[PDB]
From a paper:
[name] (CVB5) is a genotype of the Enterovirus genus, which is frequently detected in clinical and wastewater surveillance.
We applied a combination of 2D and 3D classification steps in cryoSPARC package to separate the particles corresponding to mature virions (F), intermediate-altered state (A), and empty viral capsids (E). We believe this to be a result of formaldehyde inactivation. Nevertheless, the reconstructed atomic model closely matched the previously published CVB5 structure based on genogroup A (and a previous study64). The root-mean-square deviation (RMSD) of Cα positions between the two structures was 0.45 Å. None of the mutations were located at the interfaces of multiple protomers (each comprising a single copy of VP1–4). While we noticed somewhat weaker density for the pocket factor compared to the previously published cryoEM map of CVB5 F-particle (EMD-3032164), the switch from M to I does not alter the size of the hydrophobic pocket, and these two amino acids are commonly found at position 180 across the Enterovirus genus relevant to human infection, including 112 exemplar strains of each genotype of Enterovirus A, B, C, and D, listed in Virus Metadata Resource.
Author numbering:
A (entry chain B): 10 to 259
B (entry chain A), E (entry chain A), I (entry chain A): 11 to 282
C (entry chain D), F (entry chain D), K (entry chain D): 2 to 14, 25 to 69
D (entry chain C): 1 to 238
G (entry chain C): 22 to 71
H (entry chain C), J (entry chain C): 1 to 21
The structure:
């Protein structure tokens, strides 16, 4: 019924039988730049199916005690095949993203997570008079982990979950496009995120357009004898990718 | 206009329709209104939503910054300077940070006041003071002294004002490099990510310089200038959660971990 | 060459004029008005339309 | 020149006004607009978006994720109380920092109806029923389900649909209520009681949580702007 | 227009009509005019009733309140504050209390003056003072010190003014919770009737805060601010008997029992 | 876009103009005018109409 | 200038007893304290003519 | 004469403006 | 309007056309645009060139000169004078010298300030000062004393101003002998080439005289007047290379030999 | 009254001008 | 007898009035406007016209 969906992009298809309706940006479906809104003069590269296919990020295990996980996108996909190579070879680029987050469990398991995509998710440092390290902010496809308590270190991210890493209430993250995975309701959630910026195109290494956060508001809980290994896996595909400024690779 | 939705009368219902139940997991709000849960009367609600508009929320002149300068000092060091930075002020910063991106014109007002310093000098009667405020864009000549040629101001805009007149006022058009000002920047200045990280990488909005344009007088005077900002014609995009932590720095978003609400005795307690 | 528009008044109980004196639009006073709202982009960002009276699932 | 007279109020600086003024940069070319998604024209577009309510405000749970969870369980007795709080959106610890509260904290007066969404987050094999109810002022909060049920209420059947919405109607002697706590514009009370027990099969955890979300109805507004008491500084930030 | 009724000529009458007699008990006034009691001439009375209109009666700027503050003090305690209360002033209160309910806009004017305090300091020559008046609605941040961040005023309306300029002026639109302001309230704040009783239960109109925005100078100064109120566009309902007792409190209607008129020697005495 | 109306004058022996300069009706000057009166609601609040020339009773 | 630009003023309601002019009050009668004997001023007797 | 009110910014000298004289 | 040229899409090219090569020797620039060298996309470039117009470049009020005078002195020697000369100021001169010829009206603004001199006098309280600025065209009567009849000003234009008022302002129409003002003059005043050489041979624009119009007071005062120039309606011809050497004299173009650029380690170095 | 702003040059006496009085 | 013209605005998202108060054109405010450009007199001062796509010589 409306619980079943299938998405085909490039050479990859994801079929889901128990899912939420698809959340779409701020009501905007991703498109290519118009002549009216353009900067760079060179004819852009449009890899089409070469990069618009789905890629899978490293899976994580959901513990009953887990505080949550996050990824930054332009960085997360930097080694993802040709998407990766096209950003490694260009000064400017643009793409939207389809984010499909999966976590199946038996009917006897309970818990619930927020799946949210947040633009410009600039991070605060655990040490006040300092800035966070590059590896504390992103590890490519490896998720970073939120802390259950206040954390510390000179280049550490203040990862305490309750402030979402940025000094806001975690409970107010629902402003941003989001969807929930409630184990009694569905196995997956889908968010479509258009490119959002102050500029038509940007440098894909210096700036992370958005961060994906997975936050367990209701921790995983189960009876004994039930399966103890319950993974969360994330699969993403760029859309309408465009590149400008072909150059010596970085 | 911008009138609040009114209320439609609603009688008893016995049917298969289920406005009461939904799926929050889907990422949208319920559209349920009182007519769907209880019997209602018609209400011609004439209330408007004008104060909720973005323009009204932001168009107030906030104090952003203030500094001081004196009419006496060492080797011409009698001027104040301030790097434009709207993040040094807690209340305005908070309001502005509600939107990720914004495009607006900015109206400025200055309030200039002064006072006497403790002195042993008799005969301090002095003429009315006139002040000069000059804006130097990035890369312009810089004052190093109050009597420097850098104050000639052949191109750089500036304002001269005499005490007792209405406070100075001026309009600044939207000036970004991009199509909006960013409130947040999840990135680095450099490609090797070795420069600073965060919003301050985009802050290259110039500096104000301020001084008296009178000569010195034996009676020492200290002056204070308050700079006020009033955004106009403001269009905003992508709202964000308001901050719960108190601000620590103007150059970043570092924060002290903070709880989400004041506590109470129990979950059923009325005394919050 | 002034324009004429209305003042905000209370509902369920008037014009004023406005001339621009500057060559730069940045000099104009704030664009305060009722405008319009479209909350659906934030409250209903969903591809498949939900019906208020219907079950969300199936 | 034209004879004129100055009125009172001349040469004053009002922080809340509308006047024209000279440009610092005549004929300045302003960078063109682009279609950035997510344009906000009005704050109600935000107030109508829900957020999760930190209902469990046990003092020791304030800095935990647990603040957002309402505990429920299998009970040996009928009609026990699940939760409750007064309806004071601009003051109560339950609502003051939610998105609706954060916007209201910049206003002095407010009016309109409110929605509360309750999402069951227990196992799929778990079922039960709850009473969601609002009791207008003139009596204190209900002390038993029997009393609670005499107000405005919804019986929430936990089944396939995971969420249920309690709509709080506008009931006031006034057109507007104060944002701040006030005795005259008393809010009334919102409570929840068990209707039935939470029933689970063997080898299922009976202990489970419910999340509550809050947002404004289409009929909602505010009257005048104020600063907010939620932020403070001692000196300029550097 | 609003012309007084004129007079119709009236000749001798001999009839059964009895305009002279009535029944006061019925609760209405007699409509008898001179033409009904004596022979009259025609009079084209051109007098109007304009000054009797409610708008003219009330639209005058009354002093409501005044207070003071100094340019020196202890630990930042150099500001004045005043809770809005229109009942602290005897003349205005009396006029306003004539109507049970009223709906109006209010125009405010401030008059700011200052003087020197006795001092032993020589060299007191000082720059012109500028003052800040800020309004804080119920629940806003509150100043505790003259240099508190609470004075940033990002949203709260405020006025800055320099001495020698025309006195400050501003318009406040009707702001009640209900559809009229009540002058009287025969009731309690609480349902158990344990709070206060009377009109003060509705008074939650915010507070004004006032201070100098100059820095301090060795010569001590004390300033006084008078706040004036001028209601406009005033619609009123349900007139009441004017008070005979003198007011005792701003928060209530307690009174000293008072007679109804000055006495005299006898009921036929001409010397009152 | 000013309106033109009359000045109060003495009876039995003139126009002025009025432009609004603000976007808020609260900014307008006082509505002083002759209006109208209807004292009957306070002087004759009676269901059964009395005739001036007639006895009040019967 | 308004302190609160574009302020939404609470709607009117038809409160009975509207007064447009003070003569609407002056034309309403009251009882005259005719008996102003000095010792009767604080008594109800002030209104009685014996 | 015509009633007027002076706004903020009166009697100021801006080096970047357009007025008649 | 004054819109920048837009960009036309351009596909692959294989032809005899050679937009890439030219002959610089011919004295004209290449007209090559990106569409001629690389494949391009269409770009609707909406940028304008308004700030590049000559009028905007020059119409700013620059300080040109300032001088001083006192309220006490010897034998009436209490006035300042200044020969009009726009070459005494480095920033304005530089901008003006970019065009060989120019025709414009000039708007002047004066900024007048004053201060106290060190003194042993008590009782220096004084009335507000008023200043007189007078222009004397070449050949007019000249002040020799502050009380000279030369200040009667029956024809010569002058401005009187009181401190505390807005700074003085006045418009001067284009006044050249020729049809444009020359910025440069490669010639001599005399036919035998025995007079001066260069631009100063044309400078016969008159002198300003300035003084107080109060009488003297025991408390000594020194005043400073800054004169500002804002060209308007400016038409220019024949642009010139901007100067690299620093100015030495107002009366000529003598210069200190100067290099053409800051150096660097090598021709391939990125660190300039 | 009508909002106005004073420009530079206010309240100055020019010996060469044209105004009504 | 004021003229009405436009304000400069941003491209790819208004009138103002201008009256002269003086008898001398020197009293008018600056003639700021877009005007027009003709760079060819400085960039292509050549008798024999060059074609962009062609060799400069022969
Ligand atoms: C001396 C008179 C001229 C004054 C000119 C001052 C111009 C300073 C720049 C103001 C705009 C700053 C906008 C910052 C907004 C942001 O980045 O979030
Ligand atoms: C600092 C400038 C802004 C001033 C804002 C002050 C607004 C205070 C409220 C005034 C209205 C009070 C009406 C009371 C009438 C009544 O209840 O009978
Ligand atoms: C006292 C009031 C009147 C002031 C009159 C001052 C007129 C001085 C002449 C100004 C024009 C000078 C133009 C020089 C330009 C050039 O040669 O390059």
């Amino acid at each position: 019924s409306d619980r079943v969906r299938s998405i085909t992009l490039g050479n990859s298809t994801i079929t889901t039988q128990e899912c939420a309706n698809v959340v779409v940006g701020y009501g905007t479906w991703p498109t290519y730049l118009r002549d009216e809104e353009a900067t760079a003069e060179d004819q852009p590269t449009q890899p089409d199916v070469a990069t618009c296919r789905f890629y899978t990020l490293e899976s994580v295990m959901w513990q009953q005690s887990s505080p949550g996980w996050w990824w930054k996108f332009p960085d997360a996909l930097s080694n993802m095949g040709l998407f990766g190579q096209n950003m490694q070879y260009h000064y400017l680029g643009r793409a939207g993203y389809t984010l499909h987050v999966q976590c199946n469990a038996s009917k006897f398991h309970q818990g619930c997570l927020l799946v949210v995509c947040v633009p410009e998710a600039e991070m605060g440092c655990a040490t006040i008079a300092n800035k966070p390290d590059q590896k504390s902010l992103s590890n490519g496809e490896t998720a970073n982990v939120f802390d259950s308590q206040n954390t510390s270190g000179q280049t550490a991210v203040q990862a305490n979950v309750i402030n979402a890493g940025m000094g806001i209430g975690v409970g107010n993250l629902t402003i941003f496009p989001h969807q929930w995975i409630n184990l009694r309701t569905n196995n997956s959630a889908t968010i479509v995120m258009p490119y959002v910026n102050s500029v038509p195109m940007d440098n894909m290494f210096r700036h992370n357009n958005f961060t994906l956060m997975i936050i367990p508001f209701a921790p995983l809980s189960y009876s004994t004898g039930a399966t103890t290994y319950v993974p969360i896996t994330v699969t993403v595909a760029p859309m309408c990718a465009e590149y400008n400024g072909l150059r010596l690779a970085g | 206009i911008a009138r609040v939705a009114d209320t439609i009368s609603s009688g008893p219902v016995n049917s298969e329709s289920i406005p009461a139940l939904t799926a929050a997991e889907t990422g949208h709000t319920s559209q349920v209104v009182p007519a769907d849960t209880m019997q209602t009367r018609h209400v011609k609600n004439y209330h408007s939503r004008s104060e909720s508009t973005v323009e009204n929320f932001l168009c107030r002149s906030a104090c952003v910054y203030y500094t001081t300068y004196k009419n006496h000092g060492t080797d011409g060091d009698n001027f104040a300077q301030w790097v434009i930075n709207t993040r040094q002020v807690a209340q305005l910063r908070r309001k502005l940070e509600m939107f990720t991106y914004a495009r607006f014109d900015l109206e400025l007002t200055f309030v200039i006041t002064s006072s006497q310093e403790q002195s042993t000098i008799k005969g301090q009667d002095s003429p009315v003071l006139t002040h000069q405020i000059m804006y130097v864009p990035p890369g312009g000549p810089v004052p190093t002294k109050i009597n420097s040629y850098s104050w000639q101001t052949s191109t750089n805009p500036s304002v001269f004002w005499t005490e007792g007149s209405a406070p100075p006022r001026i309009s600044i058009p939207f000036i970004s490099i991009g199509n909006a000002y960013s409130m947040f920047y999840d990135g680095w200045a450099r490609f090797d990510k070795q420069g600073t990280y965060g919003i301050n990488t985009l802050n290259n909005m110039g500096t104000l310089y301020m001084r008296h344009v009178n000569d010195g007088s034996p009676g020492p005077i200290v002056s204070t200038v308050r700079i006020y900002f009033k955004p106009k014609h403001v269009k905003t995009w992508v709202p964000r959660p308001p901050r719960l932590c108190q601000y620590q720095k103007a150059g970043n978003v570092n924060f002290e971990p903070s709880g989400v609400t004041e506590g109470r005795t129990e979950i059923t307690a009325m005394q919050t | 060459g002034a324009q004429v528009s209305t003042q905000k008044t209370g509902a369920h109980e008037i014009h004023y004029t406005n001339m621009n004196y500057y060559k730069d639009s940045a000099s104009n006073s704030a664009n305060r008005q009722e405008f319009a709202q479209d909350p659906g982009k934030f409250t209903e960002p969903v591809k498949d339309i939900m019906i208020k009276s219907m079950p969300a699932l199936n | 020149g034209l004879p004129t007279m100055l009125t009172p109020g001349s040469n004053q600086f009002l922080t809340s006004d509308d006047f024209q003024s000279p440009s610092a940069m005549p004929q300045f070319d302003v960078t063109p607009e682009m279609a950035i998604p997510g344009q906000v024209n009005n704050l109600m577009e935000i107030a109508e978006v829900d957020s999760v309510v930190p209902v469990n405000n046990t003092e020791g749970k304030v800095m935990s994720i647990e603040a957002y969870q309402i505990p429920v369980q299998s009970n040996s007795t009928n009609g026990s109380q699940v939760f409750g709080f007064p309806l004071i959106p601009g003051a109560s610890s339950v609502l003051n920092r939610t998105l609706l509260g954060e916007i209201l904290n910049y206003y002095t007066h407010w009016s309109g109806s409110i929605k509360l969404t309750f999402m069951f987050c227990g196992s799929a094999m778990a079922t039960g029923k709850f009473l969601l109810a609002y009791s207008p002022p003139g009596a204190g909060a209900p002390t038993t389900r029997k009393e609670a049920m005499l107000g405005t209420h919804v019986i929430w059947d936990v089944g396939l649909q995971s969420s249920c919405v309690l709509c709080i109607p506008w009931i006031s002697q006034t057109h507007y209520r104060y944002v701040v706590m006030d005795e005259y514009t008393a809010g009334g009370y919102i409570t929840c009681w068990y209707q039935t027990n939470i029933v689970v099969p063997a080898d299922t955890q009976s202990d489970c949580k419910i999340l509550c979300f809050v947002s404004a109805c289409n009929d909602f507004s505010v009257r005048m702007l104020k600063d907010t008491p939620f932020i403070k500084q001692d000196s300029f930030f550097q």
